[PDB]
Structure 1
Amino acid sequence: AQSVPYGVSQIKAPALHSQGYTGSNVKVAVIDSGIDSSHPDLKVAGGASMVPSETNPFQDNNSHGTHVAGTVAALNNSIGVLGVAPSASLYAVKVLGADGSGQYSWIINGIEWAIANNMDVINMSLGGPSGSAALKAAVDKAVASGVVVVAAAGNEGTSGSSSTVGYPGKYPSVIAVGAVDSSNQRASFSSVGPELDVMAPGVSIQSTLPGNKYGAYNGTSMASPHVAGAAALILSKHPNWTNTQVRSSLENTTTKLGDSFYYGKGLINVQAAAQ
């Protein structure tokens, strides 16, 4: 038996899948720790590693990347869970090492691979507190090239009234995602600031783990791939909407929550975005 994680439902993905919109022919690059291509509930199309000492994109020594991949596209079968865009082509772009750390340039290089292999959507569930020129150039170039770019907002909760949104999420060209619970309540840990764009389910999110396993994680890391999967669904309905139209759609059709400092525009609703 296959279960449907609550997050998939909260954002109205099943409504679209029922009308035949599953993410088909859309290329999503999960920029992260690798994806276990050997997992039963996943189908990884290809990928590459920017991590010098770990050069197999299909070996996830950290487990993070496998969990994120599953929220985007866990297969639609009679086992496991169900991703937002179960037919999306999934690319493993490995930029984080077994301990989860990646150098900026690994990240940047990964985005660069993402651009040149014609990815449609990039998911980056990673962040650091400083920005950089090369980093900004690279995310901005992705957006110019027409890729949808989504990133986790960060996990530094709130702090006075200063922004706690990290990079790359902090950049205007990127969709930055905060996390709510099944109650549409902001997770206490979710970063705040005027740079946050939208919210998604990020509290005990069930997904795939390496070794044919399943589990639940918390983090704006788990909210991101929901938006990334959401973006893939709309491109599967409307293959020649621009990244700009997809973004706009996601942003204008949200369910509003609290003030925008803690909630951006609110919870995405892919059925509504897809019109």
Structure 2
Amino acid sequence: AQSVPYGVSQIKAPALHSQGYTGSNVKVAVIDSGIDSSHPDLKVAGGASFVPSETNPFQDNNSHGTHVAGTVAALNNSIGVLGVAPSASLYAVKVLGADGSGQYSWIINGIEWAIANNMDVINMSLGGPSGSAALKAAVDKAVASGVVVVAAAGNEGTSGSSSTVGYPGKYPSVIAVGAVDSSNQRASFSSVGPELDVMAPGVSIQSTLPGNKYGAKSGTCMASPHVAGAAALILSKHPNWTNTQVRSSLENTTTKLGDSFYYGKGLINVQAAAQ
């Protein structure tokens, strides 16, 4: 039996699926710990490794990248879970090692790969406390080249009156995604600030794990792929739409929650966003 994870339904993804909008022919790059290409519920189209000691992008030694990819594109079948954009062309851009960490050089090389490889959507379920001129340049070029760039806002919670939004999420060109639970409440870990764009489900997210497994994870890292998945859904309907048009539609059609410093524009609604 297939299970539809809460977060899929919450964002109104099945409404587009019923209409035949499933993200077919949209290339989504999961810039992460790799993807387990061996998982029965995933179809990996390609990718590349930027981790010097872990040369195979289709070996997830972490679990992180397989779980992110399952949220985006877990196949519509009789098994496992259901992704947001189940027909999307999934790319494993391995930038993180087995420990879940990576060098800036590795991540930036991964972004650079994604631009050269004509990726429609980048998902970056990662962040750091500090930026770089090279990090900003790679995200900026990706947006200038027509790529939809989506990132996790961070898991830093509240800190006085300051923004706790990490990089690359902090950059204007990037969609920064915060976490809500099933009730539409902001998760206590969810990074806050003026740079917060949108909210998506990020608490106890059921997805694919390596070795034909399924399990839940929590974080803004879980919320991000819901937005990257939603961007793929829009593009399958409106193939002609710019990255700018995709972004404005996602932010302009949200279910409004609390204050923008905590919730940004609110919860994404792909059904309203797809027009």
Q: Same fold (TM over 0.5)?
A: yes
Post-superposition offset of 1:211: 0.3
Post-superposition offset of 1:51: 0.5
Post-superposition offset of 1:206: 0.1
TM-score, structure 2 as length reference: 1.00
Cα deviation 1:178-217 (Å, max 9, x = unaligned): 0000000000000000000000000000000000000000
Post-superposition offset of 1:96: 0.1
1:162 and 2:155 correspond: no
Aligned length: 275
SS in 1 for 2:16: helix
CA distance, structure 1, for counterparts of residue 31 and residue 212 of structure 2: 21
Post-superposition offset of 1:87: 0.2
CA distance, structure 2, for counterparts of residue 95 and residue 34 of structure 1: 8
Post-superposition offset of 1:274: 0.2
Q: Could you tell me which residue of structure 2 aligns to residue 197 of structure 1?
A: 197
Post-superposition offset of 1:153: 0.1
CA distance, structure 2, for counterparts of residue 82 and residue 164 of structure 1: 31
**Root-mean-square deviation (CA), in Å?**
0.3
SS in 1 for 2:77: coil
Cα deviation 1:50-102 (Å, max 9, x = unaligned): 00110100000000000000000000001000000000000000000000111
Post-superposition offset of 1:171: 0.2
CA distance, structure 2, for counterparts of residue 248 and residue 24 of structure 1: 22
1:77 and 2:74 correspond: no
Q: Which runs of 4+ in 1 moved over 6 A?
A: none
SS in 1 for 2:182: coil
SS in 1 for 2:138: helix
SS in 2 for 1:165: coil
CA distance, structure 2, for counterparts of residue 34 and residue 53 of structure 1: 13
Post-superposition offset of 1:45: 0.2
Post-superposition offset of 1:46: 0.4
Post-superposition offset of 1:258: 0.3
Q: Could you tell me which residue of structure 2 aligns to residue 122 of structure 1?
A: 122
Aligned pairs for 1:3-42 within 5 A: 3-42=3-42
CA distance, structure 2, for counterparts of residue 148 and residue 43 of structure 1: 21
SS in 2 for 1:273: helix
Post-superposition offset of 1:136: 0.1
Cα deviation 1:208-240 (Å, max 9, x = unaligned): 000000000000000000000000000000111
SS in 2 for 1:123: strand
CA distance, structure 1, for counterparts of residue 262 and residue 53 of structure 2: 39
Runs (5+) with no aligned partner, structure 1: none
Post-superposition offset of 1:147: 0.4
SS in 2 for 1:102: coil
Post-superposition offset of 1:272: 0.2
CA distance, structure 2, for counterparts of residue 118 and residue 184 of structure 1: 35
SS in 1 for 2:30: strand
CA distance, structure 2, for counterparts of residue 160 and residue 121 of structure 1: 34
Post-superposition offset of 1:11: 0.3
Post-superposition offset of 1:122: 0.2
Percent same amino acid among aligned pairs? 99
CA distance, structure 2, for counterparts of residue 58 and residue 82 of structure 1: 20
CA distance, structure 2, for counterparts of residue 105 and residue 256 of structure 1: 37
Runs (5+) with no aligned partner, structure 2: none
